[PDB]
A and B are shown apart, each in its own frame.
Chain A
Amino acid sequence: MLKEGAKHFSGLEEAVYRNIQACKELAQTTRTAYGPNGMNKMVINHLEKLFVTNDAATILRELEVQHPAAKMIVMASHMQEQEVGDGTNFVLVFAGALLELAEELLRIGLSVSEVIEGYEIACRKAHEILPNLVCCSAKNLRDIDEVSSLLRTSIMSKQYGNEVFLAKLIAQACVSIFPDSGHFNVDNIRVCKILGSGISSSSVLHGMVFKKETEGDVTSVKDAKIAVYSCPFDGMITETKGTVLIKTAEELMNFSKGEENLMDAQVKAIADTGANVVVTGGKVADMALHYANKYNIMLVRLNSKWDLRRLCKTVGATALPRLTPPVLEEMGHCDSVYLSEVGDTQVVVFKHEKEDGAISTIVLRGSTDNLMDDIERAVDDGVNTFKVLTRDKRLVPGGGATEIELAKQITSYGETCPGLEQYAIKKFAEAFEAIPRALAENSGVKANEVISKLYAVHQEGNKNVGLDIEAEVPAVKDMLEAGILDTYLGKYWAIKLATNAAVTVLRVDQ
């Protein structure tokens, strides 16, 4: 500077060059991602485990950048994560690709502000021709093949080895309880990891799955409303210790008598109030167990933080610390409570049957919890792509098969308009080309060959490429007729948010 005021870390040379090179580094984790891939990115964070992901949301939040230009796009990606599932990766690569292309424009003698203008135009034309790239759509949501084709694309983006089993499984276990036409819930479906057994041994269970073992008798009543307490037992009286063992012998008699009579009252209050399944995140003593056998209450030994969380969202529950008798107020929408072993481990099964506020669970079985964390990305994106809130989801060619189509239309259109805008319009075509480049890099061959041979076949609306040997040399595969389809809504928000993100960040200079 020339000033000992006016703080900036961007501006001049650093806006034009440094910001773009940073966007480029974030978006390197998604030029190995999106559709067919074998990439795995390991990220640690002292979580006492290894975290394996090929999803943009977890990669992005971990990674901190000190520049507003790179930091801003992470928010746009999260926005597309809420409204839709898979395509999160596609949002960041697009914004990041467009920005590399942009800097080249700046070099020649073109101004920032027209280039900014020409993207808004290109984004509007691309969306306008987008529902004219619908080639296939669902009509029934209770039919497993029409739902699974959609699911498949989310799963694919993760690994290209787990596409077939999972895509069937989710549709089988239901995310079609809701009409998905005005209303859909995604906190009334979780992905619940059950350690043990293989991942083709991943199963269908309906309603809330909690891993913790069941103790005592089990209920099967319809008067069973859920009461949730984080800690309702710790010993009803805490000791102090004066002989550094007990305080002391006659007192130890009283400490035990008072625990057993207070726990009797507490557990009888639960029994009376209509709570016939109590979730204990505390500790089940013999005294507490002895009471719940008499009243006929299903008892859940232990809970961890993760298990408590799903009860408060789904039930409309609160998790109260207790050692003084309480009453119902957690309530529940669950009538039936059954008991069924998943993984050869005793699992607590909640169910009721309804459309709205109805529950389902894609439950998994896996060798380790790491293998289950990646699978989970595939599955949670597969629930979030379901949300469109129609039953005709207007499926457009998944897998990046749309991308070349958009690019061809846009480059021609660019020619027609005059001025400086058009160059940005052309660049806007070559940003879509990012997706065919990343699929080429994993496939094992250069960019020149794939983009040219997709262009060669003209208007197709099917063409995209895999990880295969078919994916390399003739560089032609059918991803309309392989049942690789994605939803119109998922591609819409991906392109929309990414164009908005690229324009705001290209403006900065402070």
Chain B
Amino acid sequence: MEGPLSVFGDRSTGETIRSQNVMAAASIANIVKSSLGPVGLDKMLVDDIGDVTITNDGATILKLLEVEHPAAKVLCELADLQDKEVGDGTTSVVIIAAELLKNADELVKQKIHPTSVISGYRLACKEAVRYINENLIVNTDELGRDCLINAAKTSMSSKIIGINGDFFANMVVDAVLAIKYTDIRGQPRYPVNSVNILKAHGRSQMESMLISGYALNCVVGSQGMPKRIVNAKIACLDFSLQKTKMKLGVQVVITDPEKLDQIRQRESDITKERIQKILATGANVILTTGGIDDMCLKYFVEAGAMAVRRVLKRDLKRIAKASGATILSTLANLEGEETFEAAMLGQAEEVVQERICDDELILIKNTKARTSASIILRGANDFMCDEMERSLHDALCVVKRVLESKSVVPGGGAVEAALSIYLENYATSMGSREQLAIAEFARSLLVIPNTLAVNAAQDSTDLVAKLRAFHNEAQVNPERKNLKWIGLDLSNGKPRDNKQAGVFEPTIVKVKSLKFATEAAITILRIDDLIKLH
């Protein structure tokens, strides 16, 4: 607070209460200026005084915070609402919004009509969006230099942990194209979480191998069971199998030790019975979903029982669909005399076991009922592979979004840097009250790539200087090729000429970034009447 305290609950009337609210709005934003981009910086938020969390994501930061003003309150919720939407635009949206709200209360107040003043802000975003739609000059992965091969290459060079864009470019191309499930949300799209990406420790540090068809992860090292019988047909049992507990459970209500005991003797026998019947059908490899205890591991090994274990359910789940097996379609027992089907078997070209790089894999070559691929990263450690995966995932997300909306832009603050000059040429042209409306809208766009620059320590001054030159009054064109630059790599923090990097983000996120920053000005304004309630 400041002003009189004649009334309370964020009422002080006149100039003072407006001034109080906008400063506070600005404090939130300043936190998120330093955390802006993929260059964003870690913050420490102390949550009591015996707890801490380390975060560097824009929406997350704001959630833990203690709002205590109406301006505070509307701005956190705007960020969180955007997090719900996509979760991209989250660092940026706040920063633009801080400037907008302050400028607009002044201009709406300086009315001829208040609906007209707000409409100018709308008019600036309508040109912006239109521009954004017209553009296919940067972030096009479908008419790239090498299509999806180039898009991935530049993405892996921007998020480099070694030598990448080499082996790793090819992976991105494979994984999107390995899903043949079209998800019609505006144009055909593929999930990038229906892919199987696997880690393998041992051998060459920065490598990849493409596998035709999905693969099941396991390891041999203390097993004596067969599971490496080369075949072509898999019986996929969603069904748990355990030699100790698959009928038994702890009862402490039955006095007699017999009931617990008897079922246990019988469950060593029936496991042996159960496997032969499944095999007879057509399989020589069985994939069994249930997990196993370290204590139980010795029994399966000793009895000699034919089972695939140390399985990963997610891997198994992909195989069953692709082979055309069903995991569940007739089972309902827990005896070893249990029925089994010839349709719960699936088909592959071969089900062959290779051990490559110190990891045993059963590899399903060329799956039938639909085709896939599984890319297994190769590091000299398991840890190396986590880094490589996370960077690749980013590459894969940007590619998928590109498929949905044909139209693309160099995303981040780069679309913004272009639009500043254009919405200014337009502001001037219109004149009157609307010239201010667009012009405050416009200058707010220039500031975000400059603030981002600071974070990677390339500075604001260096950024503006290089960039505005390329834009001109006869280079207002959207083109489809460079003659003026318009992108801006955001990791580099200075403009380059990589026009398909994964630090660009398409039209889908960037249109809603513009709308959410404006909305914050409309909304704080939306009130009619101010009262204190005792």
- Bound CA–CA A473/B462 (angstroms): 8
Confirm or deny: A325 has a beta carbon within 8 angstroms of a beta carbon on chain B: no
How many whole Å from B218's CB to the nearest CB in chain A?
54
- Bound CA–CA A445/B457 (angstroms): 13
How many whole Å from B467's CB to the nearest CB in chain A?
14
Confirm or deny: B461 has a beta carbon within 8 angstroms of a beta carbon on chain A: yes
Number of chain B residues whose Cβ lies closer than 8 Å to a Cβ of chain A: 2
- Bound CA–CA A445/B461 (angstroms): 9
Tell me the nearest residue of chain A to B466, going by C-beta. A473
Tell me the nearest residue of chain B to A473, going by C-beta. B462
Residues of A close to B461: CB separation below 8 A: 444-445
Interface residues of A in 436-477 (CB under 8 A from B): 444-445, 473
Number of chain A residues whose Cβ lies closer than 8 Å to a Cβ of chain B: 3
Residues of A close to B462: CB separation below 8 A: 473
Residues of B close to A445: CB separation below 8 A: 461
- Bound CA–CA A445/B460 (angstroms): 12
- Bound CA–CA A444/B462 (angstroms): 11
How many whole Å from A410's CB to the nearest CB in chain B?
30
- Bound CA–CA A444/B460 (angstroms): 13
Residues of B close to A444: CB separation below 8 A: 461
Residues of B close to A473: CB separation below 8 A: 462
Tell me the nearest residue of chain B to A446, going by C-beta. B459
- Bound CA–CA A473/B461 (angstroms): 11
- Bound CA–CA A392/B462 (angstroms): 44
Tell me the nearest residue of chain A to B461, going by C-beta. A444
- Bound CA–CA A445/B462 (angstroms): 10
How many whole Å from B453's CB to the nearest CB in chain A?
14
- Bound CA–CA A408/B461 (angstroms): 30
Q: What sequence of 0s and 1s flags, for each residue 431-463 of chain B, a beta carbon within 8 Å of any chain A beta carbon?
A: 000000000000000000000000000000110
Interface residues of B in 192-250 (CB under 8 A from A): none
Interface residues of B in 129-168 (CB under 8 A from A): none
Q: What sequence of 0s and 1s flags, for each residue 90-117 of chain A, a beta carbon within 8 Å of any chain B beta carbon?
A: 0000000000000000000000000000
- Bound CA–CA A445/B459 (angstroms): 10
How many whole Å from B249's CB to the nearest CB in chain A?
69
Q: What sequence of 0s and 1s flags, for each residue 467-504 of chain A, a beta carbon within 8 Å of any chain B beta carbon?
A: 00000010000000000000000000000000000000
Interface residues of A in 110-157 (CB under 8 A from B): none
- Bound CA–CA A445/B465 (angstroms): 14
Q: What sequence of 0s and 1s flags, for each residue 459-486 of chain B, a beta carbon within 8 Å of any chain A beta carbon?
A: 0011000000000000000000000000
- Bound CA–CA A108/B461 (angstroms): 38
How many whole Å from A474's CB to the nearest CB in chain B?
12
- Bound CA–CA A444/B461 (angstroms): 10
How many whole Å from A340's CB to the nearest CB in chain B?
52
How many whole Å from A446's CB to the nearest CB in chain B?
9
Q: What sequence of 0s and 1s flags, for each residue 184-210 of chain A, a beta carbon within 8 Å of any chain B beta carbon?
A: 000000000000000000000000000
How many whole Å from B463's CB to the nearest CB in chain A?
12
- Bound CA–CA A263/B461 (angstroms): 74
How many whole Å from A475's CB to the nearest CB in chain B?
12
How many whole Å from B310's CB to the nearest CB in chain A?
54
Q: What sequence of 0s and 1s flags, for each residue 222-240 of chain A, a beta carbon within 8 Å of any chain B beta carbon?
A: 0000000000000000000
How many whole Å from A241's CB to the nearest CB in chain B?
71
How many whole Å from A226's CB to the nearest CB in chain B?
60
- Bound CA–CA A473/B463 (angstroms): 11
How many whole Å from A32's CB to the nearest CB in chain B?
19
- Bound CA–CA A444/B459 (angstroms): 12
How many whole Å from A397's CB to the nearest CB in chain B?
28
How many whole Å from B524's CB to the nearest CB in chain A?
38
- Bound CA–CA A473/B466 (angstroms): 11
Tell me the nearest residue of chain A to B462, going by C-beta. A473
- Bound CA–CA A473/B458 (angstroms): 11
- Bound CA–CA A499/B462 (angstroms): 38
How many whole Å from B516's CB to the nearest CB in chain A?
36
How many whole Å from A471's CB to the nearest CB in chain B?
13
- Bound CA–CA A482/B461 (angstroms): 28
How many whole Å from A501's CB to the nearest CB in chain B?
37
- Bound CA–CA A432/B461 (angstroms): 28
- Bound CA–CA A167/B480 (angstroms): 54
- Bound CA–CA A473/B465 (angstroms): 11
Q: What sequence of 0s and 1s flags, for each residue 382-397 of chain B, a beta carbon within 8 Å of any chain A beta carbon?
A: 0000000000000000
- Bound CA–CA A249/B72 (angstroms): 96
How many whole Å from B260's CB to the nearest CB in chain A?
75
How many whole Å from A468's CB to the nearest CB in chain B?
13
How many whole Å from B525's CB to the nearest CB in chain A?
40
- Bound CA–CA A116/B415 (angstroms): 59
How many whole Å from A133's CB to the nearest CB in chain B?
33
How many whole Å from B457's CB to the nearest CB in chain A?
10
How many whole Å from B430's CB to the nearest CB in chain A?
34
How many whole Å from A449's CB to the nearest CB in chain B?
10
How many whole Å from A469's CB to the nearest CB in chain B?
9
- Bound CA–CA A87/B461 (angstroms): 32
- Bound CA–CA A444/B465 (angstroms): 13
Interface residues of A in 153-195 (CB under 8 A from B): none
How many whole Å from B466's CB to the nearest CB in chain A?
9
How many whole Å from A388's CB to the nearest CB in chain B?
42
How many whole Å from A132's CB to the nearest CB in chain B?
37
Q: What sequence of 0s and 1s flags, for each residue 40-64 of chain A, a beta carbon within 8 Å of any chain B beta carbon?
A: 0000000000000000000000000
How many whole Å from A301's CB to the nearest CB in chain B?
58
- Bound CA–CA A495/B111 (angstroms): 67
Interface residues of B in 98-120 (CB under 8 A from A): none
Q: What sequence of 0s and 1s flags, for each residue 408-445 of chain A, a beta carbon within 8 Å of any chain B beta carbon?
A: 00000000000000000000000000000000000011
How many whole Å from A308's CB to the nearest CB in chain B?
54
How many whole Å from A15's CB to the nearest CB in chain B?
38
- Bound CA–CA A473/B459 (angstroms): 12
Q: What sequence of 0s and 1s flags, for each residue 292-328 of chain B, a beta carbon within 8 Å of any chain A beta carbon?
A: 0000000000000000000000000000000000000
- Bound CA–CA A392/B322 (angstroms): 90
How many whole Å from A404's CB to the nearest CB in chain B?
23
How many whole Å from B379's CB to the nearest CB in chain A?
35
How many whole Å from A313's CB to the nearest CB in chain B?
52
- Bound CA–CA A27/B461 (angstroms): 28
- Bound CA–CA A273/B377 (angstroms): 111
How many whole Å from B7's CB to the nearest CB in chain A?
49
How many whole Å from B461's CB to the nearest CB in chain A?
7
How many whole Å from B492's CB to the nearest CB in chain A?
15
How many whole Å from A184's CB to the nearest CB in chain B?
47
Q: What sequence of 0s and 1s flags, for each residue 60-98 of chain A, a beta carbon within 8 Å of any chain B beta carbon?
A: 000000000000000000000000000000000000000
- Bound CA–CA A319/B461 (angstroms): 62
How many whole Å from A442's CB to the nearest CB in chain B?
15
How many whole Å from A498's CB to the nearest CB in chain B?
34
How many whole Å from B465's CB to the nearest CB in chain A?
8
- Bound CA–CA A234/B519 (angstroms): 87
- Bound CA–CA A58/B33 (angstroms): 47
How many whole Å from A33's CB to the nearest CB in chain B?
24
- Bound CA–CA A30/B40 (angstroms): 39
How many whole Å from B462's CB to the nearest CB in chain A?
7
How many whole Å from B450's CB to the nearest CB in chain A?
16
Q: What are 3 of the A-B contact pairs (CB < 8 Å)? A: A444-B461, A445-B461, A473-B462
Residues of B within 8 A of A (CB): 461-462
Per CB-CB distance, the 3 closest pairs between chain A and chain B, nearest first, are A473-B462, A444-B461, A445-B461
